[PDB]
Amino acid sequence: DYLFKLLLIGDSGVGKTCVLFRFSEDAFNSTFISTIGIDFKIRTIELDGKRIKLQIWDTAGQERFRTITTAYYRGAMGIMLVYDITNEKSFDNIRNWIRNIEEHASADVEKMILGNKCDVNDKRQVSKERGEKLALDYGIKFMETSAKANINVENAFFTLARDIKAKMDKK
């Protein structure tokens, strides 16, 4: 009875795709993100009684499909920004990606920062604290996660979807 269109963006090798496949609970590793730079997945969930279809685009920034990937930004209801806590420029860039969202996507879109690979603390370069401040500055939610250990992936989406729905039941 609801259909939310979601997008995952961020630097390459951040984990965006495993984040996805985890939440999509696909039993396979098989993707086109490597050889196309786009992938797609659905899941319907229940939020306060109702069935919610989630349509999750995974983009990989290749200029080969610049025009198509805008179509995803322009039509996205919620867009997760992902960095790798093991890698700084991924995080540094989170501003750059926000520029895009602001510039290519809609005015009221729902946003969420996802500091990924948290499970690996031994190679951590980005403090969690520093990440939540980034988020609060921009006034959007933040959440550390691990596609592999399975930490907070599901919570991230359910959380984003609640923000979306709540925004819609207001109107």
Binding site: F28, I38, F40, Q55, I68, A71, Y72, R74, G75
Partner: protein, 64 residues
């Protein structure tokens, strides 16, 4: 003398509003493409998960 600016501005209005129109349609074009590419992938995926579960089925018949 000023007539050149007089035109230039009349010309800006026309171009400003044609530009607005042109954008309403970029919006549609994109929704349609989404819906289409959406289903394209959906299928490609379904069709692959069939070929693999096929292999898995007679993979397990062979270990038993």
């Amino acid at each position: 003398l000023k007539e050149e600016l007089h035109r230039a501005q009349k010309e800006l209005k026309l171009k400003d509003e044609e530009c607005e129109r042109l954008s309403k349609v970029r919006e549609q074009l994109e929704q349609e493409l989404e819906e289409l590419t959406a289903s394209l992938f959906e299928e490609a995926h379904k069709m692959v998960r069939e070929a693999n579960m096929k292999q898995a089925a007679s993979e397990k018949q062979l270990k038993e």
